[PDB]
Every structure is written in C-alpha cells, then in structure tokens.
Amino acid sequence: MNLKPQTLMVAIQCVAARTRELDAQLQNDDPQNAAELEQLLVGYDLAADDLKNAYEQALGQYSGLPPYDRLIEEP
C-alpha cells in the first residue's frame, strides 16, 4: 500500500537519525560488532534512497509537504 506521506516523513527522519547515531558510534566508540554494523549501514542507506524516491513521488501528489532536503538536515 502507499504509506501516508506523514509516515514517509517520519521514516526518512528516523532512518537519517539512526544512521548518524550508528555512524558516529562506529567511528567514536569502537563497538563490538563493527563489521556487521558497517554492512547494516549500507542497508540503511539503500532503504533511505527507496524512501527518497517515494517521497519525491508524494511531493507531486500532495501540497504543504516539506522538501526532502529539509527532512534529512542535521538538527
């Protein structure tokens, strides 16, 4: 099903934010399964890209949505 566009916004934001958080751990905290985590983050980025194409589509169907680049901005 199409997710609602608010759902896409949230998922994009959460994916971006977990990706920053786990990338920062990967580099600053020497975590226990670093190698597995690095591959997980590739999977997160691919998902991010799929969410981004879906949100570009939603931008053509709805009004009042924030632009993609604002959603993934570092706060």
């Binding site: 990706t19 990338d23 983050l41 590739v42 980025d45 691919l46 890209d49």
Partner: peptide
C-alpha cells in the same frame, strides 16, 4: 546504478 551515497562518497 543507484545513487551516489554522500556518507560513503561512492556510488552504489
């Protein structure tokens, strides 16, 4: 060809 990934600075 998928997107350029900025965090990795490489195209996936």
């Amino acid at each position: 060809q998928d997107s350029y990934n900025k965090r990795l600075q490489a195209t996936h």
